[PDB]
Design a protein around this ligand. Structure first.
Ligand SMILES: CCOc1ccc2c(-c3ccc(C(=O)O)c(C4CCCC4)c3)ncnc2c1
Length: 278
């Protein structure tokens, strides 16, 4: 182990978009936490060398993550509890409440969830996302591997590393970031038309739900250009087995509407018959 202030840093427990996450024991309160450990220089470099324009100050993104996290207080969202950041040190450390069981699934898996368990987790996901959205945050990387399961069997949305805060009613984007199998079709073409950020989160929720019950994404190809083409052009299909409920198929179909103008919205998802039954 190593010591960092009141923390003893131990095994690696996670690795997200940036940095790495270590288990951290707090000797002041006898409690374990999750500590994300980052290099400011490395983050700068990750955005690429100075010369779709690269914005000018890339270290801004981690401080924006921090500012986002400090605004969020919800049972289905991870909780930032401390930031350690010496201006004369290259490292920056973000301390979170620990969510004991870790990610709910790493796609792909041969071991999908049952429909009922998928519903339970999905209900948590809806609570967390509507709260984010209300707080004018889009997550931009919703996927089962960013969903941590607590000892209480509830999910917390994690990894705000590419999240964005918007003003007014929605984020308006020309391009976006995301895990490619989770990105919505409107974000994958070069078009003159911007797109809305909240609907990207819904598409990703849809792909997540599909993954919850089938263990793999609905559109998949190892050739990136073919993956993008399928996202844009391939009709959604469900495998023959496992044989899910028709109302779940309906919900997924609506979340995976390729047209963001008609795609289901969160307040509607909450009231969908699949969500409200048990
Ligand atoms: C066996 C327990 O495993 C974990 C792993 C990561 C945790 C994080 C955590 C804290 C930060 C981050 C991040 O990278 O911003 C992440 C990402 C890493 C991969 C999944 C999400 C996770 N926060 C709280 N609790 C955790 C528990």
């Amino acid at each position: 182990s190593m010591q960092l202030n009141q923390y003893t840093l131990k095994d690696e427990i996670g690795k997200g978009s940036y940095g790495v996450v270590k288990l951290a024991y707090n000797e002041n309160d006898n409690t374990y936490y999750a500590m994300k450990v980052l290099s400011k220089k490395k983050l700068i470099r990750q955005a690429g060398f100075p010369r779709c324009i690269q914005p000018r100050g890339p270290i801004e993104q981690v401080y924006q993550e921090i500012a986002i996290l400090k605004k969020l207080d919800h049972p289905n969202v991870v909780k930032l509890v401390e930031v350690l950041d010496d201006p004369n040190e290259d490292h920056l450390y973000m301390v979170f409440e620990l969510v004991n069981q870790g990610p709910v699934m790493e796609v792909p898996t041969l071991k999908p969830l049952s429909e009922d368990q998928a519903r339970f987790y999905f209900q948590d996901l809806i609570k967390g996302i509507e709260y984010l959205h209300y707080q004018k945050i889009i997550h931009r990387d919703i996927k089962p591997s960013n969903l941590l399961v607590g000892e209480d069997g509830h999910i917390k949305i994690a990894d705000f590393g590419v999240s964005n805060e918007f003003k007014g009613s929605d984020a308006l984007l020309s391009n976006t970031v995301g895990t490619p199998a989770f990105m919505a079709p409107e974000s994958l073409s070069e078009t003159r038309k911007i797109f809305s950020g909240k609907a990207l989160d819904v598409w990703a929720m849809g792909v997540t739900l599909y993954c919850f019950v089938f263990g793999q994404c609905p559109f998949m190809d190892e050739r990136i250009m073919c993956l993008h083409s399928k996202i844009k052009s391939q009709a959604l299909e469900f495998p023959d087995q496992p044989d899910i409920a028709e109302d779940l198929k309906d919900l997924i179909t609506r979340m995976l509407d390729k047209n963001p103008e008609s795609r289901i919205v969160v307040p509607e998802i909450k009231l969908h018959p699949w969500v409200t039954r048990h």
